[PDB]
Amino acid sequence: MTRRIRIGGAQMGAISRSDSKKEIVDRLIALLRQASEKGCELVVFPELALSTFFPRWYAERDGMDGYFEDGMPNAATLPLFEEARRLGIGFSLGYAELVQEDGRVRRFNTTVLVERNGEIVGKYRKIHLPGHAEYEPERSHQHLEKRYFEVGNTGFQVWDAFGGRVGMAICNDRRWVETYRVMGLQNVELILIGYNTPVNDSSETLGMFHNHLTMQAGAYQNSTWVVGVAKAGVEDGHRLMGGSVIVAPTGEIVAQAMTEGDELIVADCDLDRCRYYKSHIFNFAAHRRPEFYQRITSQTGVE
C-alpha cells in the first residue's frame, strides 16, 4: 500500500452560460468532498472545468477573457484550494489561463496539478489545439479553440508527485500517440487527462469507442495509468461526450462513468503495476530503435 494511490475521477455535468462561477466551484467542492468520503487521495477534474465550453461560440480574439481565470488560485477558486488542503487531497484542475508574459497577454488551455499539501507542483498547457481558427458557416456546430488559445509553451512534462511519476494531457492530446510516448520516455506512471469532446447531433458508439481505444492503447503501450475525466451533458443544446474512465497499465478499464452529469469514479491504482511491462515487454532501453523513428520529429505532413 506504499505506492498505491486512490484516484477519483470527478466527471462534471453541463455548465451553461447562465451558471455563475460560484455555482461551478460549489459543484467542484461537492465532487471533492465525495472523494474524501471514499478515501481518495487524488481527484481529476475535466478540461476547462471553471466555465462553459465557450470555444463553441464566436467572438473577438480578445472578447472572451471573461471566462479566463485572473489568478490561480483567485477569489473564486480559493475555496476549492482551501477545501482540498484541509482534507489533504491533491487535484488536477483544467482552466483557461490568462497570464501576462513579456508584455503581451497570452491565453492557454491549462491544467494545474496540486499536491495533497495544497502546493502547485506542475502546470501543463495544451499543445494540440483542435477545431478551426475562424468561423465556418456550413458546419452545424463551431469549434474555435485555435481562435482563443495559443499553443502551450510547457511541453509534455512529468513531475515527482503522489509517490510516483505523474504527467498531464488535455483533451484531443489523447488522440496522438506522441502524447503518451513523450511522457512515457520520462518513466511516467500516471497520466491525468481532462477532455471536452462534442457529439454531433444524429454514430455515438463509434465516438465512445475511439475515446477509450486511444486511452487503453496509450496506457498499455507505455505501461502507465491513465485517468480520463470528461465534462458531459447537454450544454446549451450542445451534447458533450461522457464515458469518464480510469485505465490500468494493462490497458484494462477499472472504472467507468455511467451518467453525463456530476459523477465520481474511483479506483485504487498500484503504481508498482506500471513495472511489469517496463521490465520486459516495453523496456524502452532494450527494444526501442530511435534510428528508424526519425520521420516523427523531422517532418510534419507526409512524404
Added chain:
Amino acid sequence: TRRIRIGGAQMGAISRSDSKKEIVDRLIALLRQASEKGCELVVFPELALSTFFPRWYAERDGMDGYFEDGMPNAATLPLFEEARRLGIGFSLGYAELVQEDGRVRRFNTTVLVERNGEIVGKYRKIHLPGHAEYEPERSHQHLEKRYFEVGNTGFQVWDAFGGRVGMAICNDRRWVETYRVMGLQNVELILIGYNTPVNDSETLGMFHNHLTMQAGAYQNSTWVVGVAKAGVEDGHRLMGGSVIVAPTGEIVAQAMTEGDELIVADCDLDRCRYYKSHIFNFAAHRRPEFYQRITSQTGVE
C-alpha cells in the same frame, strides 16, 4: 473506386518434421481458396516457410537450414507461379540469408509481390524480440536476437495495389512508432504477420494483440491486416486471432480457429481519406517540436 479484397491467410502449426514441400502446398491451398473468394491480395504470417525456430537453442552459425537462399528459390517457385497465374499478389514472411557488403547477413524478412508477379517491396524486421542467450528459467525459449540481426531497410511504404502499402513483422505492432512512421508516408494498408507464443492469461494476450492493431489503424487512418501462424507447434502453443482492421479501428474480419484459415474483407482504401482530411491531418495538428524525446532517447530520463 480503389477497393481491394484482401485475404488473411492464417496458418496452422508447422513442426520441424514438416517438409518444405508440404509447407508450400499449404500456402498454395490458401492461395487458391482466396482466388475462389475473389481476393486480390493474400497476407501470409511471419516466417511462413519454416517452424518458429527461435524456439530452440543453437549457435548463430546453425539454423541456416530454415533460412532461404534466394527469393524465390526452387521450393518457393511454385507459389510465385500460381500467384501470377491467378492474378493475385501476396506478402510472404521468411528468414532471409543473403550476401551483402561482403559478410553473409541474416534477416527476418517480408516480401510484397504484385498481382503481375513482380517483387514490389522488401521489409526486414527492426524490433527483434526475445533474448540473445539461453535462459533455463523460461518454460519456452525465444532467441530471435540470436539468429537474426536488425534489418537495414526501415519502415517503407510503396505504391502497390492502387494505394499505399507498408509492412511490419510481429512485435513491431506493439510499438506506436511502427504505425506512425508509415503513417507519415500516407500509408493506407499495413501488412503484419506475427508469431507470438502463448504462456499457459490467454484472454489478455489476445486483448493486447488487437488493442495495438486497432489503435495503430485508427490513429493513422489506415487498414491493418494481422495474420498469424497459430496452433500447438512442438508442444508450444502459438496465438491466433488473425484480424483485418478498418481505418476506424474496427475489426471487420477475425479468424475463428488456430489452423489454416482464411479471413476475407473488402477494403475501400478511400475510407482512409475520411480522417486524414481533418481528424488526423498530420500537416495541420502535429507539433513535432514537442516530440523530440522520441528520436533523441532510447530509454527513460
